[PDB]
Design a protein around this ligand. Structure first.
Ligand SMILES: CN1CCN(C(=O)Cc2c[nH]c3ncccc23)CC1
Ligand SMILES: CN1CCN(C(=O)Cc2c[nH]c3ncccc23)CC1
Lengths: 304, 304
């Protein structure tokens, strides 16, 4: 019993973190096999950051300009390339701690763990969601760039995020491990505004199910709704529309609790309309949207 | 920028987790040097759990009755002893992944990371606080016993908690690594009620400072208070009393923000009296009390 914002165990990823220095800038890199992945803005001066031409800046850089340190031992760089917004530094040594891994590009609403790192050393781990506006609400200070987001399936680390920048609103933007930004963001020091940060409705419903499973049931009501009726209310409250694909994904939680998805939607509808009236659900005074239905089943079943 | 409930990187602890089986019960153990630490209730049948005499039950157990598996390799048990509520199984092999470590008994209000484990395998990591009633609000299912709470200082893991049981209210009780329960709890399947779960005032104030540092300032007011005046209000709201030791610990956050501790107390006083009025602080609709002043400085400074 109990329900916590839970991160994946970070050890498999800790074993991949290194320090990358180009000139006076140090940030983090991800060492998998004989490649080190890092944000391309490592090559930029503060001046360059305002309006960088990365291809032109990169011409001035050689393998020996990329200093890669794994613990307190230097790796030899034997190649470099730019893929979208990441640099791939080929090193002469395969990371001996390379886990089974994939690179995945996640959808908005998907959660992942972040291993916040500075100078290639882990500082902490927390759980994030890719927001519907393709930002993440992380905890990142200068030097945290190259920190990675990931999910784990038994022994396979799926890398989904690499940290690149903070927007002037203090929300975070980054890439997949192919170097493609989530959302419309660019690695340039220019004011970039985020769109509407809507609530991840299917995740809220997952968390309401988690609440029921954990004995927090006060919000269960006598009502039902329809997807169309629910969605009118969702749109009014800047909630993402619910689709039958969302209802399908909530099936196992529906079956475990015996609460029809549309009934739980009607409960959610009343919470939106009435608020919490000073009550809490799983120790929260707001509706939590950074647990996926998969997250709730995993936590509630004890997958390792 | 941004402020997250952040756990320590768990890799150093992942390397210590093993599976302990006695008869038909499997739970987790902590392998440090040539000792495996686990809850003594591993020796109990369901029947035994109702009113166990652990010394008498342990007489019936030999070294070869304790099955210790590290990954998928069995460890040879060459000794066993009971220290308070934990068993110490001496094995013939030092854990090669043993980190620098200490055993510490934490105070109520102190935070720690939990590596939730099942069958000696990590499932996830989250941040907890020792509640003033000596419970923790964890996320633990059957098989999670022997999971450990810890803090890390650079390269030294301080182990502070080992999970033993859930109370009928679904809150959690456990021991330090000398086997002494936090609070009045006993490892027996008998109804045990928790006392008042008061709010950790110094932690709320730490988190308000964290909010100011991160640009959430709407709650800063024109008022000040005194420790005695604040404490009258604290007691009314089931907040822990604030002492000058708490004010001392908040000094660095006071200095960083230029907000006198007693001014922040007066802000907190108004939040208690007025509530949040549907507003949030660091994405929370309630006052968060599971960040210590040390946690806030660490996260806000990027210690690795
Ligand atoms: C292209 N350019 C954009 C601006 N940059 C950052 O925002 C880096 C960064 C990521 N998280 C942070 N948190 C606090 C302060 C700075 C950062 C550098 C790269
Ligand atoms: C002395 N006896 C007391 C009762 N026990 C537990 O509560 C073990 C336990 C710890 N977390 C849990 N979460 C869910 C279900 C069970 C547990 C066994 C030991």
């Amino acid at each position: 019993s109990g329900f916590r914002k839970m991160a994946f165990p970070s050890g498999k990823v800790e074993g991949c973190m290194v320090q990358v220095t180009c000139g006076t800038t140090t940030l983090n890199g991800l060492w998998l096999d004989d490649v080190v992945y890092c944000p391309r803005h490592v090559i930029c001066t503060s001046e360059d950051m305002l309006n960088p031409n990365y291809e032109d800046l990169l011409i001035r850089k050689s393998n020996h300009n990329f200093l890669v340190q794994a613990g307190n031992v230097q790796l030899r760089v034997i190649g470099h390339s730019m893929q979208n917004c990441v640099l791939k530094l080929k090193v002469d040594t395969a990371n001996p701690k390379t886990p089974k891994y994939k690179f995945v590009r996640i959808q908005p609403g998907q959660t992942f763990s972040v291993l916040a790192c500075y100078n290639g050393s882990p500082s902490g781990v927390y759980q994030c969601a890719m927001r519907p506006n393709f930002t993440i609400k992380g905890s990142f200070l200068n030097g945290s760039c190259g920190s990675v987001g990931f999910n784990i399936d038994y022994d396979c680390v799926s890398f989904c995020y690499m940290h690149h920048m903070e927007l002037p609103t203090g929300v975070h933007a980054g890439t997949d491990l192919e170097g493609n930004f989530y959302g419309p963001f660019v690695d340039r020091q220019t004011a970039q505004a985020a769109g509407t940060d809507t609530t991840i409705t299917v995740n809220v419903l997952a968390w309401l199910y988690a609440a029921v499973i954990n004995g927090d049931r006060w919000f269960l009501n006598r009502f039902t709704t329809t997807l169309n009726d629910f969605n009118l209310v969702a749109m009014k409250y800047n909630y993402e529309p619910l689709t039958q694909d969302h209802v399908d994904i909530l099936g196992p939680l529906s079956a475990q609790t015996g609460i029809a998805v549309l009934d739980m939607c009607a409960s959610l509808k009343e919470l939106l309309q009435n608020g919490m009236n000073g009550r809490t659900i799983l120790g929260s005074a707001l509706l939590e949207d950074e647990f996926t239905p998969f997250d709730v089943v995993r936590q509630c079943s004890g997958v390792t």
